[PDB]
């Protein structure tokens, strides 16, 4: 009761310390020093510096792809510090921790990505940029459908009107998933997940007393996240067999045998 409340506020505060761009901030921007808008080839060129990228120094779609890759490496880092905060996560065997994060991150990355999306585009560069859904759609095959499925999910997911104190627990539930392939000691993970799923349930009962069957609707979404990952991984296969394209080794470490 008051335990599950104290755990809700714990994860919310960890979430805030761990992720610098929150749904609260993203929504303020999307409904507002406006973001630079990239809607076509020439606006991509004008706004290229908005796209955070650090390297030594070449097709338009590859640069977007690299950009998304660049930022995902950082999302992984963020999610990891967050997991380290979910009570008992650090106490699990250190090989399971790696597997939970391994399969957990894509699901989390796409859940939080929804926060930065509306039906027309996605925030980039900590809200400094806005790249339109239509622009991404126009990129030559197979990069034209790289983002589209993500936008399709986001719109559905955003209609749930979840806020940061809700996603904090939802995200912690996903990490502590009990059916991740190759898990050694499955029991302790599910104990905490059971304890987080009940915390989520109460959090949705108080914070959203009007929207009925949200908890229900929310667990259903958690099944589509996995579908979106599946499509993604399958699409990466195509790209990897036709392009000449390079993947960060933190990402390669996650995709290997996934």
């Amino acid at each position: 009761s008051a335990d599950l409340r104290a755990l809700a506020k714990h994860l919310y505060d960890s979430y805030i310390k761990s992720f610098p761009l929150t749904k609260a901030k993203a929504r303020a921007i999307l409904t507002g020093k406006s973001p630079f808008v990239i809607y076509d080839m020439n606006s991509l060129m004008m706004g290229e510096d908005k796209i955070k990228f650090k390297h030594i120094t070449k097709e338009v779609a590859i640069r977007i792809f690299q950009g998304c890759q660049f930022r995902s490496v950082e999302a992984v880092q963020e999610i990891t510090e967050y997991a380290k905060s979910i009570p008992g996560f650090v106490n699990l065997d250190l090989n399971d921790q790696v597997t939970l994060l391994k399969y957990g991150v894509h699901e989390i990355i796409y859940t939080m990505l929804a926060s930065l999306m509306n039906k027309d585009g996605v925030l980039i560069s900590e809200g400094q940029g806005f790249m339109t859904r239509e622009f991404l759609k126009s990129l030559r095959k197979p990069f034209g459908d790289f983002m589209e499925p993500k936008f399709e999910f986001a719109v559905k997911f955003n209609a749930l009107e979840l806020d940061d104190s809700d996603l904090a627990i939802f995200i912690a539930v996903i990490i502590l998933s009990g059916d991740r392939p190759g898990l050694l000691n499955v029991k302790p993970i599910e104990d905490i997940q059971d304890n987080l799923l009940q915390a989520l349930e109460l959090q949705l009962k108080l914070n959203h007393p009007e929207s009925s069957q949200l908890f229900a609707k929310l667990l259903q979404k958690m099944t589509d996240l996995r579908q979106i990952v599946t499509e993604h991984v399958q699409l990466l296969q195509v790209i990897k067999k036709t392009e000449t394209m390079s993947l960060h080794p933190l990402l390669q470490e996650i995709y290997k045998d996934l």
Binding site: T80, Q97, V98, L101, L250, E253
Partner: peptide
Amino acid sequence: RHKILHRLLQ
């Protein structure tokens, strides 16, 4: 086996 993830957890 997953070196970067390990060092991120350490």
